[PDB]
Amino acid sequence: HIEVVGKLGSTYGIRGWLRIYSSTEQAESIFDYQPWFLKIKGEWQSIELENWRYHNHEIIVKLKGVDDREAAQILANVEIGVDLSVFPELEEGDYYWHDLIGCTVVNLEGYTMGTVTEMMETGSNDVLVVKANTKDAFGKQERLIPFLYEQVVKRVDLTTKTIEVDWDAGFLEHHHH
């Protein structure tokens, strides 16, 4: 279950913010987990993160119940932990699918197919449900693109949240040339 991933520091400002030091393998990664757990009196106390930002090469955090210098003072130097245990076994697809939701699909011709709103499994066939852009060139509202690696879905790039596919926009679409 719970594993240490950081430590709270000195209070900043007068409204509750305080510095942070994360043991997380890289750095900002401690922010991909919720809720957080502060070890107080040798016990894990759950706590919600509200926001965070940079203050001169120094990350600073703002927690839910903390709203002032004195309330943050109490938390100085306590360990932060998160629940890294396994997630429930999915009855459909895999966790990686979740990263495709919201990506933009563009075919080999550079045409923007729209934003993928859902991965749909109908039987043994998985399909990306793409919400076409407002009034796109071929009059389609939605596209069902087979989630097939190599022949249809060429690449996924979360760096710019994009999915490249070899899928015609419409019958009359012009090709490479």
Curated annotation (Swiss-Prot):
GO molecular function: ribosome binding
Occurrences of domain PRC barrel (ranges): 92-171
Keyword Nucleotidyltransferase listed: no
Superkingdom in the source lineage: Bacteria
Gene Ontology biological process terms, A to Z: maturation of SSU-rRNA
GO cellular component, one term: cytosol
One matching Pfam family: RimM
Keywords for this protein: Chaperone, Cytoplasm, Ribosome biogenesis, rRNA processing
Subcellular localization: Cytoplasm
InterPro entries linked to this entry: PRC_barrel-like_sf (IPR011033), PRC_RimM (IPR056792), RimM (IPR011961), RimM_N (IPR002676), RimM_N_sf (IPR036976), Transl_B-barrel_sf (IPR009000)
Family: Belongs to the RimM family.
Task performed by this protein: An accessory protein needed during the final step in the assembly of 30S ribosomal subunit, possibly for assembly of the head region. Essential for efficient processing of 16S rRNA. May be needed both before and after RbfA during the maturation of 16S rRNA. It has affinity for free ribosomal 30S subunits but not for 70S ribosomes.
PANTHER family membership: RIBOSOME MATURATION FACTOR RIMM
Subunit structure: Binds ribosomal protein uS19.
UniProt note: domains: The PRC barrel domain binds ribosomal protein uS19.
NCBIfam families found in the cross-reference section: 16S_RimM (TIGR02273)
Name of this protein: Ribosome maturation factor RimM
Protein species of origin: Haemophilus influenzae (strain ATCC 51907 / DSM 11121 / KW20 / Rd)
Gene assigned in the entry: rimM
